[PDB]
Design a protein around this ligand. Structure first.
Ligand SMILES: NC(=[NH2+])NCCC[C@H](N)C(=O)O
Length: 606
RNA sequence: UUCCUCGUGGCCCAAUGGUCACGGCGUCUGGCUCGAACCAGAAGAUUCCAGGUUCAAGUCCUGGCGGGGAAGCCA
């Protein structure tokens, strides 16, 4: 067809400058196909280079304004009224089978895609590629190391630890979906006096048979108990001659390689990782490596010392060595790299770890998912690596996030993650029981309840931008009405239920449905929404925000739910039921894809 | 005290610099004779304040105010 010929042409077209065109994939992103069509046709009309038009096309804030629009003033056409050009260019714009309409509105031109055209390409594509619908592959292998969660092995997970964990998990899924090779790394805080305190504390209150049940638990009590011994004694008996002192020594003792002090280390660490594996799996996360501050090689450490001098970065003061970053950035200030007693610090270890990682992986990019509470820390060791001469220093990125507020150890207002998950699970289980008929159709009610509960906990956290702080509130986790995780699960479940009720019409028939039977307003809106998923993923890797995907999932499910009320699959002609099944089936697949990307587990019944 | 960050409807929150702003909660009005954890409709706007940059500012700049965070031997 002429239309068939154009599609082939457009899918092979590269109009935007290589810089941006490199991200244009009309073959797997319908909106990029439309960007090509619109840029090409508007160029013929305006006389403006299509590569200048392409980046000026923006997605709209609301569907009432079209699918794409262009602000005329953005083309910088001197001596011309933007409003008039909009009217002139829109009036003669060829729609073909691509566009339903083109409209001038103030200094803008709105482009409305033809939904029937979209349905014919998008629906079969979603049903065929399924989980790969909005994905992409790279011409050349790119490897990224994403470090997330990274708790200190000495403490249980509280509401706060959830953040780095799911943000990193999301980013890992997103990068893999878009072609990258991803290394999921957990940088355990398993070194420093922090750990040297557990050593002595365990020798003091360590209970063999007790450490059997649960490591992190017993080890926590010991830490709590030992911290009081050095917090109650006060500044009375000399540090080392007391307790806290004979703890700093055990650390430097561990640095010397004291087989005994190290054997206990490898024990607490190994016991924590085994437990971690199950905890992270519950959140659909499997790390490739459980690294740690203890894993920094001596070579890198020594090399870092040499570079600090070779570059004249460090200078002695107060008996300790630090780096004055003020020369490079006023904000960075001064940072200590070696304590008076010659021991390494958190910052010193990060520099050496970055060096080991590059040597072992030769990454093209490395992302640290760390709280903004550590913005300065990250900004300092990033700069240091830069001034050290490393070319790859520029490939490091800090993805921060805000705090979960309402937590306090010295107040006991802290809420543990396991208790949150368990409580949310029980609440969702309760809601599940209210519908006797539906409940009786679930094989593992308890397990389904946990998946719904976790979706509630993750979504409440990912709804706003990462940078935002948010106070812990049980209602945030327990709510199920409105824009919540359970809302996404319910949408997925009833779409599955609709499919099952019409199991007489297999998915094979859907791809060959008569898509001209999806002309109702509600159907057209849903179709347009389906074609946006690829753009959303692309934008999500740019913002690194789960909310970018979450926001879309709610727009998607809101429309599906609106449609659910007026577009019935059952009790229709075979052809209309097949077409609507195809539309709902495609919507479910996209929801499934997005939910899985975020780290949730879509349920079939609830 | 210095620096960073956030401020959007009674509460939470979205936004490529691109048309006085997306949703949810609360509240009002309706709908259970393919899943009502839902839907249809209503209502609610000093995008914190004063200026600035720009053809165009919720978005960028300076300052103020309020919340939060950080700031030479913790992580
Ligand atoms: N490379 C890093 N510093 N990663 C983050 C470490 C976080 C540290 N373990 C703490 O609990 O705050």
């Amino acid at each position: 067809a002429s239309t068939a010929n154009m599609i082939s042409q457009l899918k092979k077209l590269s109009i935007a400058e290589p810089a941006v065109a490199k991200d244009s994939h009309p073959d797997v992103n319908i909106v990029d196909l439309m960007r090509n069509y619109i840029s090409q046709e508007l160029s013929k009309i305006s006389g403006v280079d299509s590569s200048l038009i392409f980046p000026a096309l923006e997605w709209t804030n609301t569907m009432e304004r079209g699918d794409l629009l262009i602000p005329i003033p953005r083309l910088r056409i001197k001596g011309a009224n933007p409003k008039d050009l909009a009217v002139q260019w829109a009036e003669k714009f060829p729609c073909g089978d691509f566009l339903e309409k083109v409209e001038a509105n103030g200094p803008f031109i709105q482009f409305f895609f033809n939904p029937q055209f979209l349905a014919k390409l998008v629906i079969p594509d979603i049903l065929t590629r399924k989980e790969d619908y909005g994905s992409c592959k790279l011409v050349e292998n790119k490897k990224v190391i994403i470090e997330f969660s990274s708790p200190n092995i000495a403490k249980p997970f509280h509401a706060g630890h959830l953040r780095s964990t799911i943000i990193g998990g999301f980013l890992a899924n997103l990068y893999e979906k878009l072609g990258w090779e991803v290394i999921r790394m957990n940088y355990l805080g398993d070194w420093g006096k922090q750990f040297g305190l557990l050593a002595v504390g365990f020798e003091r209150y360590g209970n063999e048979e007790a450490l059997v049940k649960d490591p992190i638990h017993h080890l926590f009590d010991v830490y709590v108990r030992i911290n009081k011994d050095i917090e109650e004694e006060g500044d009375s008996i000399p540090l080392e001659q007391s307790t806290n002192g004979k703890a700093r020594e055990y650390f430097k003792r561990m640095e010397d390689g004291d087989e005994e002090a190290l054997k206990i280390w490898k024990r607490f660490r190994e016991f924590s990782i085994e437990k971690y594996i199950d905890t992270y799996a519950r959140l659909n996360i499997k790390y490739d490596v459980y690294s740690g501050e203890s894993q920094v090689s001596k070579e890198s450490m020594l090399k870092a010392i040499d570079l600090f001098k070779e570059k004249g970065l460090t200078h002695e003061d107060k008996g300790a060595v630090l780096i004055d970053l003020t020369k490079f950035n006023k904000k960075l200030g001064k940072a200590i790299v070696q304590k008076s007693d010659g021991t390494t610090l958190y910052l010193t270890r990060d520099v050496g770890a970055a060096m080991d990682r590059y040597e072992k992986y030769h990454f093209d990019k490395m992302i640290y998912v760390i709280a903004s509470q550590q913005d300065l820390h990250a900004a300092q060791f990033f700069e240091i690596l830069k001034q050290m001469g490393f070319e790859w220093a520029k490939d490091l990125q800090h993805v921060n996030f805000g705090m979960v507020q309402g937590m306090s150890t010295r107040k006991g207002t802290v809420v543990f993650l396991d208790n949150i998950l368990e409580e949310t699970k029980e609440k969702m289980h309760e809601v599940m029981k209210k519908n006797e008929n539906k409940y009786a159709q679930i094989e593992h009610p308890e397990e389904v309840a946990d998946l719904v509960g976790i979706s509630a906990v993750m979504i409440q956290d990912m709804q706003g931008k990462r940078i935002n702080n948010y106070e812990f509130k049980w209602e945030r986790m327990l709510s199920f009405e409105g824009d919540t995780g359970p809302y996404l699960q319910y949408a997925h479940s009833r779409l599955r239920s609709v499919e099952r009720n019409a199991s007489g019409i297999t998915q094979e028939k859907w791809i060959n449905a008569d898509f001209s039977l999806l002309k109702e307003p509600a159907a057209k809106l849903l179709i347009r929404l389906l074609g946006q998923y690829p753009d959303v993923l692309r934008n999500a890797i740019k913002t690194h925000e789960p909310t970018t995907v979450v926001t879309y999932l709610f727009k998607l499910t809101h429309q599906v739910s609106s449609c659910y009320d007026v577009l019935w699959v059952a009790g229709q002609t075979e052809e209309l039921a097949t077409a609507r099944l195809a539309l709902y089936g495609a919507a479910r697949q996209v929801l499934y894809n997005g939910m899985r990307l975020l780290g949730l587990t879509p349920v079939e019944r609830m």
